[PDB]
Design a protein around this ligand. Structure first.
Ligand SMILES: Nc1ncnc2c1ncn2[C@@H]1O[C@H](COP(=O)(O)O)[C@@H](O)[C@H]1O
Length: 417
């Protein structure tokens, strides 16, 4: 237990001067015609690259991936265009090699300005990175154990120190996540930040801990929900999910609202464990309902008691429930939010999800530690442009999830302390 955090990071890594550092970063960026159209992921690693740079480092070899070429070189997923971006961000020349491992790679690296930055090609072009892959005719194909081993040592031969700045992909145990067997393994500033806020919230958080979950499906969250019930104090279940709970628990006339057949079967277990673990469940007691799934459709409000008429569905929290939010949230000390409270992507049904954000942002300033990790949830924080108003918005893909699901994250375990 308590594996998260308490690891090793760039910060406080003595003897970096004149050393060759290998950095695993997240460069999976959206691109159109060799034109990167969102350089945040690139700018984000600058702090790490900069620090290493002004510390000595004979070389700065960067390795990463983009897309899912599946083990075969696919020109639609080459990191070349990213190397160009870095030239302008660093203000100096950057070396691009169309390879990750090999003799030439090692040679070309050593033959490059003394404080140069070098960026190899997509690691995912080697089936040995993920382990499996597919072929030309699109058929599943598995790597060769000897090959994977060869690939992992070839990477380990690239440098002396290894810094991993790629959270969000640490839940998978790929060659670049657990293969670089070097002695010094530390987190990048990005990584370090993530590992910091999560443990600060899953290991020993300032109570009460609030978990805000949301989303249509309840069936694909059983694991998440349970693993949390035994560590949180309050929990708000919203968005679609609520309907399934409200029918199983209160015999509410859900109308046409979304109903999760599979999940309807785990509602008993949850409510039970929740009571056993002494966790308070908070569910909407009124909802805005539409006579058709689409923004701008006749809409009215009803209570859970009144119930939703036939051929009518609910699409957002009613005002009584959105007022009921203030107390639960503003009184929390730490908050893990994952899930919009309604169909936010449609203006008319985003009030419940927008008002929650303000309350989350506001409790942050009141001093509470707030973490978001949804992505679909973040996309809301992003559209609102409030990333900074929140303690930490995890840029973690599936990774964030599994850690909130209780899973282990190889990528992290393979780090020093
Ligand atoms: N009441 C609702 N009805 C339909 N979709 C919803 C509702 N509340 C939220 N959603 C969105 O529908 C999607 C359901 O996916 P998931 O959360 O993965 O089950 C998420 O991207 C939610 O933002």
């Amino acid at each position: 237990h308590h594996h998260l955090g308490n690891k090793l990071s760039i910060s406080d890594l003595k003897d970096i001067k004149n050393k060759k550092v290998l950095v695993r970063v997240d460069f999976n960026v959206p691109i159109e015609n060799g034109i990167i159209k969102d350089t945040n992921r690139i700018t984000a690693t600058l702090p790490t690259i900069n620090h290493l740079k002004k510390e000595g480092a004979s070389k700065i070899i960067l390795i990463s991936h983009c897309g899912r070429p599946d083990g075969l070189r696919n020109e639609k997923y080459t990191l070349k265009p990213v190397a160009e971006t870095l030239k302008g961000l660093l203000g100096e020349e950057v070396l691009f090699l169309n390879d990750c491992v090999g003799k030439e790679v090692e040679d070309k690296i050593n033959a490059a300005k003394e404080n140069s930055v070098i960026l190899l090609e997509n690691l995912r072009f080697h089936i040995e990175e993920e382990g499996k892959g597919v072929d030309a005719n699109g058929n599943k194909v598995k790597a060769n154990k000897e090959d994977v081993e060869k690939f992992q040592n070839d990477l380990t031969k690239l440098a002396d120190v290894f810094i991993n700045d790629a959270f969000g992909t640490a839940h998978r145990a790929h060659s670049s996540m657990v293969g670089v067997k070097l002695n010094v393994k530390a987190s990048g500033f990005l990584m370090k930040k993530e590992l910091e806020y999560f443990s600060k919230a899953l290991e020993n958080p300032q109570r009460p801990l609030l978990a805000i979950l949301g989303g249509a499906k309840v069936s694909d969250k059983i694991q998440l929900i349970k693993n949390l019930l035994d560590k949180v104090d309050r929990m708000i279940i919203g968005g679609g999910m609520a309907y399934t709970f409200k029918k199983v628990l209160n015999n509410m006339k859900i109308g046409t609202s979304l109903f999760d057949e599979a999940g309807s079967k785990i509602v008993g277990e949850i409510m039970e464990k929740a009571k056993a673990k002494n966790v308070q469940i908070f569910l909407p007691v009124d909802f805005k309902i539409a006579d058709n799934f689409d923004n701008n459709a006749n809409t009215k409000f009803v209570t859970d008691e009144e119930g939703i008429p036939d051929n009518w569905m609910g699409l957002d929290a009613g005002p009584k429930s959105i007022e009921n939010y203030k107390d639960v949230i503003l009184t929390s000390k730490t908050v893990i939010w994952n899930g919009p409270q309604g169909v936010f992507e449609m203006p008319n049904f985003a009030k419940g999800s927008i008002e929650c954000l303000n309350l989350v942002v506001e409790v942050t300033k009141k001093g509470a530690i707030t973490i978001v990790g949804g992505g679909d949830t973040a996309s809301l924080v992003e559209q609102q442009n409030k990333k900074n108003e929140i303690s930490h918005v995890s840029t973690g893909g599936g990774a964030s999830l599994e850690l909130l699901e209780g899973k282990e994250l190889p990528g992290v375990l393979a780090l020093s302390n």
